[PDB]
Enzyme design. Structure first.
Site, PDB file in Angstrom:
ATOM      1  N   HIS A 104      -7.885  -6.113  -8.456  1.00 39.18           N
ATOM      2  CA  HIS A 104      -6.779  -6.426  -9.348  1.00 39.18           C
ATOM      3  C   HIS A 104      -5.701  -7.105  -8.520  1.00 39.18           C
ATOM      4  CE1 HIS A 104      -4.782  -2.983  -7.605  1.00 39.18           C
ATOM      5  NE2 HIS A 104      -3.740  -3.118  -8.402  1.00 39.18           N
TER       6      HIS A 104
ATOM      7  N   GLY B 197      -4.066  -0.004  -1.107  1.00 42.23           N
ATOM      8  CA  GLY B 197      -2.816   0.293  -0.426  1.00 42.23           C
ATOM      9  C   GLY B 197      -1.950  -0.930  -0.224  1.00 42.23           C
TER      10      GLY B 197
ATOM     11  N   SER C 272      -8.163  -2.769  -4.289  1.00 42.95           N
ATOM     12  CA  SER C 272      -7.328  -3.855  -3.789  1.00 42.95           C
ATOM     13  C   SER C 272      -6.946  -3.606  -2.342  1.00 42.95           C
ATOM     14  CB  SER C 272      -6.070  -3.978  -4.646  1.00 42.95           C
ATOM     15  OG  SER C 272      -5.307  -2.786  -4.585  1.00 42.95           O
ATOM     16  N   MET C 273      -7.256  -4.581  -1.496  1.00 41.69           N
ATOM     17  CA  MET C 273      -7.066  -4.583  -0.052  1.00 41.69           C
ATOM     18  C   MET C 273      -8.117  -3.717   0.637  1.00 41.69           C
ATOM     19  SD  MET C 273      -5.308  -6.375   2.092  1.00 41.69           S
ATOM     20  CE  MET C 273      -4.796  -7.071   0.530  1.00 41.69           C
TER      21      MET C 273
ATOM     22  N   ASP D 109      -7.667  -5.290 -14.220  1.00 40.40           N
ATOM     23  CA  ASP D 109      -8.564  -4.503 -13.388  1.00 40.40           C
ATOM     24  C   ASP D 109     -10.005  -4.733 -13.817  1.00 40.40           C
ATOM     25  OD1 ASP D 109      -6.096  -3.558 -12.561  1.00 40.40           O
ATOM     26  OD2 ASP D 109      -6.255  -1.697 -13.712  1.00 40.40           O
TER      27      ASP D 109
END
Lengths: 179, 191, 191, 191, 191, 191, 190, 190
Positions: C121, C67, C96-97, C170
């Site tokens: 990524h 997100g 991611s995150m 990725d």
């Protein structure tokens, strides 16, 4: 609590009270007096808003909501107060000074206080929110602290001839003993 | 949904929302795009905390991408109006309006986490109509830009000229850079 | 519809939702795409738990497809700031995150389930406007990119150059491969 | 609307929703497409039941048409992690990741109704972009396929080749046919 | 809006929704298109009433226009499983699935109002894609078609040839003719 | 929004919504288009009132503009089955289905306000499909019209031929005309 | 979501929304575009507060960017025939209807913030169809238009010529300009 | 979000919404386009108030822009049927049906704010289809127009000719002019 109020209803109408002990008491000649302090709390209560709003509530308004109308029906009469007067508060200093001066008479001491100082001291002690509750404490504090140090050994032991007067710049009473 | 929490009060156990429980500790959350309704809610929270204990200092967390300026001004004036110092702790993101409120915090209390990101930009607005009508609306946008720059300089302490050139286009100031620029006093590492 | 679970205490029985009951046991749930609003709840939950028992460790289950980058930093900054060690468990998915928060957990208290998968990524974003504005916005993506790799390298312990090349595209890492990479210390087969 | 029910207790009467009342009896409903949010509710329920009684067997009524494979693994990992034997029952249909959870139950506790239908097929997913990225995402689905075949082989007991050839295309299996395949031990018609 | 009702039990006064109050009296309501969630609710209500008093008989008021087939089987499987006889009443209309559940009731307890309507149709579904996939799905509908006809024949008592012949196309059955067909036992005009 | 109302009971004050408060007085409200869901609520109220006092008459206010005929049968059949006589009061307007339920009340308990309207017209429906299927549906809708004309004649007391002529096309009957036509006994002005 | 707050009442702690508590202190919140729905909520608050204690004064915060004339006018008439002086405060911004309700408060009680931006312009509306209906509709907006300027002149005190000429086109008035214009005073921060 | 207001009772404090609390004071609010569901809610409040005190007059505010005519009759018939005299207070826009409710108010208790706007017009509706069907609907609307016009003259007291002329086309009437037409008794003094 509500149960506390319920007990009051019995004495007002029945005029008798029954407890676990079972002893009967006579309420024919008894007198009852109450005091409501809710009004004082609302006066000092802050208002949640940008600008505070004045709330000059009346004594009647609180009892209408906090107390059930059933109590008011049995109630005989309700009294109200606002403030005594500006002058009486000055006189309150004099009345306390009378008893305080009576105390000096036992010690064989004489003391005089300025008329202007008496007025200012009364205003400092008297407050609208607190009424005359703190007035008693301030009266003694003004003179008991300085006099105590010198009464053990000094002119106060024999006659006193004390003089008390405020200072315009400092607004602080000055004590001088002339025996 | 919001998770309920329990407070061990002397009277007994009570259930509060996570935000409501934090609000009792003088903690307000500015989350999402700035709007009249969310801002008005923040204003209401500030007034409630002021009455409870005006001596205590309020805390506010600014994590927002910015929004309408009109609603944000209500928070700015309210922050300075109320006696309690409104601490500002930027978390995650700050925008032109969010950063404006971040600087609005009392001196010595503004904070910004290490990885927090702050952005400042000139007010963006548009109007459509007759040429004369465009002029009056354009004047207000310019007046707002001038007024906002003046207010930023007071809290930030930077000169008006420096802010105007920097705020002409988007400027991304990290948390360490913000301290140098003056948007925030220091980063939050130890209380 | 969240179910209600009865909790029995000496004082009495109190009914709480399933999520709130687990919150009482220091179990936070990071579900769905990362956002400012859902992150505010996670941040608010950590503060409440820290006060109740700052010594006890906090567990943060993570099932997220990724997100907003900025919203997650609020959660990440709050994990390192508080005294409680924030354990992280990757249930189902991490991106991611979502994975950045997984590795952000305290050393020796990061885990992954045996059939869990995690991906990493570089940040994805875009902007449209004049070339001057695109330059500053583009430069910020590199700043967060370099900053993110510095944090991941710190937690994972690997070289910065290794993460930079790997992050570029990725990379889907299974649970056992994550231990070799350094994202998590081991697999949570049992305590 | 969900109905409410009364639970008679010596202390007093408790009001519960129909779903929550069943949860008290270790009955969890897995209905609808699998998602990250609904899976957490099932996962949170499994963890809550484990604390109440880590020895009693949990029950799961699977009436879902399938969904996100990764979210389902969060439930599969939890089923084998917790000591309780998570019995599985098939109500209506069972599809990809619905049947995988139906056969993941403990031996001797997996069941199916006489009219319950099971469907099994390989994971379906798509990604568009650069050729290099497509290869990375494509390899993941192939790796996940092998994990699905390997895991299903253990529970069903059939060789990977049989599952691999059969799972290539959609295969519908009735209750008697499913028992032969090994998805479930027996039917609930007479026990 | 749902109206509240008062019961005034010996223990005390209780308030329940109109639907919940009826559920306490073993009255279940089936309305609207059949679906997994609504069917799950009905199944939950049947299980709850089973444990409360298995000796008593459950009642079901069917006013549905038809829906998913798999969801209906879940309800049907639970009716034959539980010891209580699930009485069925046709209020307003009963479609293929509504009628399959109506006839599924125990013998001597299936009723339909005089002005009620019934309809029986073959299962309808479609699939798009490769020819091979259509072949597998096509056999599924035919197998299901035989299954519905096989079960309808047992409850109604007619030959399998008559059920399939009549159910090839939509056939409407009024209240009196339905009793002759074996779907319903008798009308509920008076007892 | 539904305003709440307070009622006085011996033990304590009772709070009920406005609609539920009227339910205690046997006052049902039929508003809006008829549907299987709203109709299910109406019959639920009727059955509840019957148990409270099967002698006291029910009052069903009618301000509906018409709806599906299937759901109306559930209400109509329920009204006739229950011992209590249902009083139908036309508020504002009564369409074909509403008028059918209006005249379905017990003789002597059918009322219409002086300014209310009453519309009646043959059932409206359409089926798009093959000729063979359309044949079945065309017969059914015609059969439905036959069942409504026969029942309307019974309650109204008019001949089947008269109803067929009047119901062939839409017709609006004022409040006084309804009394002459035989739909209601008289206007509700005194009681 | 509205946060819940605890009030230490004499009987015990009571948990209710934040707006409800401020409403208890005679604080009404006007926010967003005015409409017939939110107008009743504001009017309902005024009527309820009046019955509780008409001697006290009510407060009203204005953070609306405009709204319908009929909806906003309902609040104006309400504040007029009620004894409690309804103080008006501008938070963030005012508009044609926001400013009208801002200047409708009792003289002296109405206040405004320093960075508040007020705007006043004539009502804008249109009707399409037969020429006859547009004539009647057009003649009505002219009559009501004069009424707003008439009532505005009563509170502000400025000549109708100034208001109509100024109101013919949008006029943005800041806090100091409003004081000079005579619309409202300035907040007493002290 | 509708705010909640605490109520003072001897037994214990209670919480009610702003609208519900006003209902205890026999105050019913009306707003938005007239609808079947909205009308039944007002009707329910009228019946409840009647049982509580059939003598105490009811107050009914109106701020609606008009709606379906059929549902409005349900409110009119109930007001006439119930013994309590409804005090219709026009607080804002009052369309054809909205204005009709004002006239239905008991004589001597109808009120209208000074800045309120009350516009009356003939019923507006249409149908499309076969000519035979259009005839039925066309005759019905004309009959309905007569009924509303006839009942308008009953409360207002004006002749049918006068009512027909004002209602034939869209008409906008102010508050003072309403007293002349007999739509409302008089404006609220304070």
């Amino acid at each position: 609590h509500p149960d506390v109020f319920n007990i009051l209803l019995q004495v007002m109408d029945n005029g008798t009270l029954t407890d676990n002990n079972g002893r009967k008491a006579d309420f024919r000649n008894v007198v009852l007096v109450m005091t409501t302090n809710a009004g004082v709390r609302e006066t000092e209560r802050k208002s949640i808003g940008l600008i505070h709003q004045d709330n000059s509530t009346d004594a009647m308004e609180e009892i209408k909501k906090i107390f059930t109308p059933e109590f008011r029906n049995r109630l005989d009469n309700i009294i109200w107060f606002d403030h005594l007067s500006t002058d009486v508060i000055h006189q309150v200093v004099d009345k306390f000074i009378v008893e305080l001066q009576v105390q000096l008479d036992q010690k064989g001491v004489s003391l005089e206080v300025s008329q202007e100082a008496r007025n200012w001291l009364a205003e400092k002690g008297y407050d609208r929110a607190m009424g005359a509750r703190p007035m008693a404490r301030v009266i003694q504090d003004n003179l008991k602290k300085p006099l105590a140090n010198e009464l053990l050994f000094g002119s106060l032991v024999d006659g006193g001839q004390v003089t008390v007067a405020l200072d315009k710049e400092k607004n602080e009473l000055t004590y001088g003993f002339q025996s | 949904l919001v998770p309920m929490v329990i407070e061990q009060t002397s009277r007994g156990e009570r259930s509060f929302d996570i935000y409501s429980r934090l609000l009792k500790e003088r903690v307000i959350f500015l989350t999402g795009q700035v709007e009249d309704h969310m801002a008005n809610l923040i204003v209401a929270q500030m007034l409630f905390l002021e009455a409870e204990n005006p001596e205590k200092d309020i805390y506010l967390y600014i994590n927002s991408p910015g929004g309408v300026i009109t609603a944000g001004m209500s928070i700015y004036d309210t922050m300075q109006f109320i006696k309690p110092d409104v601490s500002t702790i930027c978390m995650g993101q700050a925008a032109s309006m969010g950063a404006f409120l971040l600087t609005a915090g009392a001196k010595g209390k503004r904070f910004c986490l290490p990885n927090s990101r702050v952005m400042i930009h000139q007010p963006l607005g548009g109007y459509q109509g007759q040429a004369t009508d465009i002029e009056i609306h354009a004047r207000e946008i310019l007046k707002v830009k001038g007024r906002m720059n003046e207010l930023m300089a007071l809290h930030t302490g930077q000169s008006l000229e420096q802010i105007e050139r920097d705020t002409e286009r988007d400027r991304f100031l990290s948390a360490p850079e913000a301290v140098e620029y003056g948007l925030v006093d220091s980063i939050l590492t130890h209380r």
